[PDB]
Amino acid sequence: IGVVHGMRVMIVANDATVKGGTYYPITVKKHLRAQRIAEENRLPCIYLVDSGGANLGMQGDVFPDEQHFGRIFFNQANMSAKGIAQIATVMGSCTAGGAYVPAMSDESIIVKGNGTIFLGGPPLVFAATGEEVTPEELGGADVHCRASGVTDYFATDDLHALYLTRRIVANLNRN
Amino acid sequence: EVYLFHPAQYESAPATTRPNVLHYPAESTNPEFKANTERMKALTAELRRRVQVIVDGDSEADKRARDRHISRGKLLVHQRIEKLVDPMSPFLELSQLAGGDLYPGEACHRGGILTGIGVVHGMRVMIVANDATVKGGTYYPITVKKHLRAQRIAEENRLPCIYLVDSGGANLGMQGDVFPDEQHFGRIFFNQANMSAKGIAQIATVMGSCTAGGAYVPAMSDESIIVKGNGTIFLGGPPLVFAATGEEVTPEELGGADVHCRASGVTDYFATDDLHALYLTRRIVANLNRNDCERPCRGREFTPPLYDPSEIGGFIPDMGADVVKGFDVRAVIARLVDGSEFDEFKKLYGDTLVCGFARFEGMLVGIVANNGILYSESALKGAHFVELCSHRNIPLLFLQNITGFMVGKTYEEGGIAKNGAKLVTAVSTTHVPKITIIIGGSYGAGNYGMCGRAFGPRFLFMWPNARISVMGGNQAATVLALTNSKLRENEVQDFKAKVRSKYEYEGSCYYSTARLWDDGVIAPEDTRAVVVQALLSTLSAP
Amino acid sequence: LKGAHFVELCSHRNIPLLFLQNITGFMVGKTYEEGGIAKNGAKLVTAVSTTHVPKITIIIGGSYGAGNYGMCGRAFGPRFLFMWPNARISVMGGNQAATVLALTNSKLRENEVQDFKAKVRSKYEYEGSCYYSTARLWDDGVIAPEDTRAVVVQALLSTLSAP
Amino acid sequence: DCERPCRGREFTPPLYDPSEIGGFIPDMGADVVKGFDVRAVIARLVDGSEFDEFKKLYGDTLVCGFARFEGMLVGIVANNGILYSESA
Amino acid sequence: EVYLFHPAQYESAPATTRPNVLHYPAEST
Amino acid sequence: PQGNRGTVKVRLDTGFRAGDDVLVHYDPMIAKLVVWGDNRATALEGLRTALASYHIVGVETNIDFLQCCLSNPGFVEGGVTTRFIEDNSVNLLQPREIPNNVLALAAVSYLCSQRGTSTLFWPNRQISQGVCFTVGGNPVVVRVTVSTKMCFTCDFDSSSVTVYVESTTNMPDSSTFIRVTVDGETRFGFTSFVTDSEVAVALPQGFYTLALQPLATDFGSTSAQA
Numbered sequence A: 001i002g003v004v005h006g007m008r009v010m011i012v013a014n015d016a017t018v019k020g021g022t023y024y025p026i027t028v029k030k031h032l033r034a035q036r037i038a039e040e041n042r043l044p045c046i047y048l049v050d051s052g053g054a055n056l057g058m059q060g061d062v063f064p065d066e067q068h069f070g071r072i073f074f075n076q077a078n079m080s081a082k083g084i085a086q087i088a089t090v091m092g093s094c095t096a097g098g099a100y101v102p103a104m105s106d107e108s109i110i111v112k113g114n115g116t117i118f119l120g121g122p123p124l125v126f127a128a129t130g131e132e133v134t135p136e137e138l139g140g141a142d143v144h145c146r147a148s149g150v151t152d153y154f155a156t157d158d159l160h161a162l163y164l165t166r167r168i169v170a171n172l173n174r175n
Numbered sequence B: 001e002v003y004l005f006h007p008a009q010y011e012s013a014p015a016t017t018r019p020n021v022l023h024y025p026a027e028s029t030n031p032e033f034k035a036n037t038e039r040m041k042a043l044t045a046e047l048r049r050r051v052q053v054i055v056d057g058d059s060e061a062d063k064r065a066r067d068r069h070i071s072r073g074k075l076l077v078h079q080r081i082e083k084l085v086d087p088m089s090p091f092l093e094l095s096q097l098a099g100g101d102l103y104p105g106e107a108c109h110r111g112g113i114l115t116g117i118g119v120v121h122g123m124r125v126m127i128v129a130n131d132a133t134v135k136g137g138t139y140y141p142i143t144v145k146k147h148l149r150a151q152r153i154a155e156e157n158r159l160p161c162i163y164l165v166d167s168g169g170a171n172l173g174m175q176g177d178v179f180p181d182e183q184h185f186g187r188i189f190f191n192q193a194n195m196s197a198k199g200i201a202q203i204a205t206v207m208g209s210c211t212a213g214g215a216y217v218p219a220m221s222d223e224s225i226i227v228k229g230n231g232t233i234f235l236g237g238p239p240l241v242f243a244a245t246g247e248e249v250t251p252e253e254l255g256g257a258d259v260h261c262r263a264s265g266v267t268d269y270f271a272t273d274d275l276h277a278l279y280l281t282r283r284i285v286a287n288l289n290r291n292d293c294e295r296p297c298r299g300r301e302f303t304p305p306l307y308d309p310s311e312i313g314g315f316i317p318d319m320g321a322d323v324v325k326g327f328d329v330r331a332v333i334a335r336l337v338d339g340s341e342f343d344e345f346k347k348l349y350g351d352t353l354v355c356g357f358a359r360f361e362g363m364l365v366g367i368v369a370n371n372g373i374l375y376s377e378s379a380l381k382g383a384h385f386v387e388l389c390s391h392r393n394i395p396l397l398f399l400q401n402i403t404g405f406m407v408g409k410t411y412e413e414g415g416i417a418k419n420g421a422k423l424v425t426a427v428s429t430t431h432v433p434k435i436t437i438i439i440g441g442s443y444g445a446g447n448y449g450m451c452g453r454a455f456g457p458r459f460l461f462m463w464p465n466a467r468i469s470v471m472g473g474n475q476a477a478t479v480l481a482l483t484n485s486k487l488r489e490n491e492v493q494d495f496k497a498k499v500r501s502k503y504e505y506e507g508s509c510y511y512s513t514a515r516l517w518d519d520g521v522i523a524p525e526d527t528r529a530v531v532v533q534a535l536l537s538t539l540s541a542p
Numbered sequence C: 001l002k003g004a005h006f007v008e009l010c011s012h013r014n015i016p017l018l019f020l021q022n023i024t025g026f027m028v029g030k031t032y033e034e035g036g037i038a039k040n041g042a043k044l045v046t047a048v049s050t051t052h053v054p055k056i057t058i059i060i061g062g063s064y065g066a067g068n069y070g071m072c073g074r075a076f077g078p079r080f081l082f083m084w085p086n087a088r089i090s091v092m093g094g095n096q097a098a099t100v101l102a103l104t105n106s107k108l109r110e111n112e113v114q115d116f117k118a119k120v121r122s123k124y125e126y127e128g129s130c131y132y133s134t135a136r137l138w139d140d141g142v143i144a145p146e147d148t149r150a151v152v153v154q155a156l157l158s159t160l161s162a163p
Numbered sequence D: 001d002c003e004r005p006c007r008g009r010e011f012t013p014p015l016y017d018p019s020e021i022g023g024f025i026p027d028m029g030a031d032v033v034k035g036f037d038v039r040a041v042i043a044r045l046v047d048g049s050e051f052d053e054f055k056k057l058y059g060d061t062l063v064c065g066f067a068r069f070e071g072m073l074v075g076i077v078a079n080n081g082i083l084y085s086e087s088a
Numbered sequence E: 001e002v003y004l005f006h007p008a009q010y011e012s013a014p015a016t017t018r019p020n021v022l023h024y025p026a027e028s029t
Numbered sequence F: 001p002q003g004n005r006g007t008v009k010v011r012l013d014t015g016f017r018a019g020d021d022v023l024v025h026y027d028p029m030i031a032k033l034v035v036w037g038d039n040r041a042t043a044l045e046g047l048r049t050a051l052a053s054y055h056i057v058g059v060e061t062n063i064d065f066l067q068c069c070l071s072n073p074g075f076v077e078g079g080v081t082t083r084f085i086e087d088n089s090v091n092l093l094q095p096r097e098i099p100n101n102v103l104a105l106a107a108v109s110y111l112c113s114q115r116g117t118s119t120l121f122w123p124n125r126q127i128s129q130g131v132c133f134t135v136g137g138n139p140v141v142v143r144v145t146v147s148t149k150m151c152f153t154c155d156f157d158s159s160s161v162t163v164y165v166e167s168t169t170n171m172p173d174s175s176t177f178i179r180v181t182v183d184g185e186t187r188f189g190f191t192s193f194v195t196d197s198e199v200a201v202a203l204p205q206g207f208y209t210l211a212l213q214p215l216a217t218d219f220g221s222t223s224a225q226a
């Protein structure tokens, strides 16, 4: 829980230095706990997204259940419906299920070089259609900020992304 | 060397380095800039001249009527406004140029009625004052429409209503367009009763006459004031009572102040003259147990715009032309918002609809402005931004310069109608206050997508260069010429010229204003001020 | 006063209201104005305007002037409004309009009195007819008197789904 | 402590001494009871002796008006004679 | 000479001229 | 300014403070002001300067009479007879002229006192205001048109005065210091004090008090009949 522009917010940031940011069962549990605290205290949520996705080694304990990876999106949608702002800043990668985090937020930010959003990664698209595409040309900042419309703010680097996040928080009409 | 600063440093930075500051300096040496400035100056001078001739009167008949009005011990309507409102306070007069060239043979100044938002004892109120110097104060259809519009604004903003009544009644020459309908003279009493039921105070001060239907205005108000000499209230006038019972009675002994203040009980306060009447009105307003503010927070730490509004006209091209040039609406926004700061929402997606956040004297406002042809992406962006502002209770400001959507088989196949419908639905179903200003042209369904008159904005104003029509004049000429196969090749230019002239005449700002299609014409340099006042008027809304 | 009290009584019971308009204004005179006839008409108008029960009005006779306003006219939001083919709606009666305009207009000469009265009477008859009102959506149609009951029933049923 | 932090304590004491109110009060127990103007009482109870009368010429036996007690707005209804239909 | 003042002047006036002030001096004699 | 000045010593002795009410027929003397110099002429000049700086608002005084006596040639010549006051009664009782600049500045100061933080705005119009003063029993009226840029234009007979108010500052002594530009070329600051009955301005030209037109005591008088 941090203070941005004098307002208390709940900040959830992926650590890409821990197995590439992949979600362990404990990672999902901690994310859900943060969402629960934010929802019951009406704290706006900021998600700094840099994660490979759910780890396939323990997918049984991560993907299918009530308190599992989809509950993140359930909580995000329900908080957005209750007027609690959901902000996503894509500092890195978000693949498959994680790609819902920027798309289901009220406002989203993507960094140019390192920000990529796609439901199907380059390995999947090559295994499906036999085509080779880089992550940048598949789900980079240009495609999602100029054509797709998934993201709302184009960030040149991490510092610009954090500035844009603060600007988004500044314009929440919260007394 | 990498990531040395903190984002708060950029947030609190001089205007040169603050990244959310719009930088649009005036190209004062550019000949096109000078031509645009000259055009805007001429238009604004004409606007001020029309307002001034309305205030001071032009013809000799106006002078005679004003002399008769003064000789009766009556104050003029604008003088009544000046002496009723707090001495040094703003007054937002709405339909200044209503009734202009509307009824041939009559100079219906102000539509026969002055409506505005004033400040009495620090509280914003809606003032509706009849002008007895315009055909004796009789209600034209435009007069009824303007009175109803003032009542609508007051009801939707919970502004107490003050009616300074001096009117002969509905004019019998046009009774078909005045008496019978939903939006006709009885709707005034319907609105008055419903506002009184909702706790919105209705105050009537009878400075002159009120006959027949108008007599309901004092009687249906919470508190009423009648002036001794000039105040008369009766359902049936002396001509009617003589034609009925054969008796002759003067208006004073029929419905004067004594009979309605000592015996009838219709009125509550006896006024010796106009000044005493205005004093009693102020005393009534003083005793409305309305709290000064729900929240005592001020938040007045704002910075004026960094660029002079007086050069806005330099960026505005000629709207009436064979080929209309395009301009960046941000140059306008930089001259209207606090510190020229503007957080753009989707800077790279819409690219023809600019959506962003700004502040007017510390009040946060979402701005939606046209910057070219509407596409599916622009409509989706506008709808998403309107939803975002609605979820945050952020008021919306629309800046309309629109020439329809993009046509073509590909665009229809992509669902442009569906996305335009999404934008229209988002604009229609929101509950935040909405203010729209026509800075350019509003043509066709695009108007509907940009919070037109039909979509219930709190206020709507037009710049003197603005044009509103079902379609552009050039577009109308081309389409009508192409469709009309009966037209001969020898008679093409004359037909195009005629239709262009008709659309120019019926699309002008004055044509719209005379018909209460907007809430007045304002100069671009005053735009910011107007917006602020409008925003303040919405602060008492539920 | 009786009409206002009855409208309040029906509103407190959620009883729909049916107005049958044949009205030629209020009673004029010094005594009646001194007694506060405008105040009582205002009470009736307020009661009609501020009620929430469904209201249906039918013009069976004439609706003239402020009396129309007191009897749930078009401006006061009835659910439906119908006119009989003999009905007339105007700001004032044709004879009343002719007499008042002739008496007020001092410019008019004695030689040109009958023609002026005939012209104004014809204008009021033309603009007050049921068809003139119907063509301008001032009502919800013209119905025969013998069908009136049926029409009312349908209208009432249409209001059964109202909140 | 308070729903609304507004104070509004900028009031003025009555301009006439309350200690002489009894001078205006006649003997209630008497064969014929004299009448007095209740406004003289009101002038010694409200802020600045200010009083906005509601219908000064209609009731004439029931004085209705607005006043303030230490900045608090209050409607005053006072008897000033026999009740009539107009006064009621 | 006619309508020279503003009603706020009468609203903010000394007790002698403020028109909504009740004047009932005691007839102590 | 009391004490040891540059060339003279000024000493003021008074029994009244600001806010006190002087009651008539009981000690009519408001104060006594003494000035010491090296010569009689220097003492007289110092007394003139000190009297010019003595600003009293609320009670009529004889400051103008004292200035006339001090500036009288007979007094400055030397010793004068006892009947001197009776000798130069016409000269000493000369009325003080009030230029239109003083009227305009007083009206502007009164309007600024009326204004709080509200902005003067009427769309496509100049806000109209009026201030009524009494000059020698004459009800003079100043009509002012004010724009959103805090620029007043006051109208007199065949005369117009433009006053641009740069800034205002509320002094702790219930007064206001106003910086103005008269016409388009005369910049200066002055002090203004506004009551419900008069407006006082301390201009570089001197000190002036203009009485507002008194309010009627029978405003809205309805004595049941006439």
Ligand SMILES: *C(=O)CCCC[C@@H]1SC[C@@H]2NC(=O)N[C@@H]21
Pocket: B373, B403, B404, B405, B406, B407, B444, B472, B474, B475, B476, B478
């Ligand atoms: C000539 O004036 C007609 C050209 C077409 C006008 C264009 S087509 C795209 C825009 N949409 C619309 O309705 N009018 C504009």
Ligand SMILES: *C(=O)CCCC[C@@H]1SC[C@@H]2NC(=O)N[C@@H]21
Pocket: B236, B240, B243, B244, C024, C025, C026, C027, C028, C065, C093, C094, C095, C096, C097, C099
């Ligand atoms: C002739 O047609 C005019 C006579 C008056 C008409 C009467 S007076 C009483 C009723 N009220 C009203 O408005 N008209 C009716």
